[PDB]
Amino acid sequence: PKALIVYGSTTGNTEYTAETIARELADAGYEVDSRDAASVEAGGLFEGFDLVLLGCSTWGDDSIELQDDFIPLFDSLEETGAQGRKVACFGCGASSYEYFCGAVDAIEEKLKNLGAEIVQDGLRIDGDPRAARDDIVGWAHDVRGAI
Ligand SMILES: Cc1cc2nc3c(=O)[nH]c(=O)nc-3n(C[C@H](O)[C@H](O)[C@H](O)COP(=O)(O)O)c2cc1C
Known part of the structure; x- marks a missing residue:
């Protein structure tokens, strides 16, 4: 499938989150388009x-x-x-x-x-999303099984 990820991040935390989710979906074979909301x-x-x-x-x-x-x-x-x-x-x-x-x-x-x-x-x-990386990976897994 084709997924679009759009994120707004001031200090890079939601951006880090978006790139972790992007990598899990691409590893599964999805075509992923990840964009900062500033350029959309x-x-x-x-x-x-x-x-x-x-x-x-x-x-x-x-x-x-x-x-x-x-x-x-x-x-x-x-x-x-x-x-x-x-x-x-x-x-x-x-x-x-x-x-x-x-x-x-x-x-x-x-x-x-x-x-x-x-x-x-x-x-x-x-807090710091790097410390909740397993939860981010787990949620990305769940979304794929949801579409
Ligand atoms: C001045 C200030 C106000 C904030 N207001 C909230 C808030 O109302 N609710 C919340 O859940 N987090 C709030 N935060 C926490 C930020 O959402 C958090 O630091 C987040 O990780 C920032 O993510 P980003 O780097 O993708 O923009 C606030 C942080 C600051 C510094």
Whole structure:
């Protein structure tokens, strides 16, 4: 299958997460297209992919703020071709904040309102993702068995 991975990362944690997931899918034979949200255009972005994985860190503290590069995409999610698309979300955060990985929840909610098919519960990483690598690998495995 063909998968598209789009991620927004300020310090590289969600980017590290996206590349770990990308490598697991490619090792299984998928054709994987991994892009930073900063270089993407929302219009028709999901057209042609069997699976779309969206990753985003959570900022803001007292109010949720999506990772800076991901904002424009989130705002135009209506134009990407999400209706009937198999999607799954992931992201880095810290459980010391009130809205832990709140960006993952906001993106899942919008995707379900747009008619996408969420294939697996989102991956929510607490702290350094390098220390939760087995969980990232495990979630990537589960998504493949879900499409
Ligand atoms: C100022 C500040 C505000 C933050 N706000 C939140 C938050 O509201 N919720 C959360 O789960 N994590 C919050 N974080 C934690 C970041 O999401 C976390 O460091 C994450 O690993 C960053 O990932 P990235 O390098 O892919 O952008 C915050 C971190 C900072 C420094």
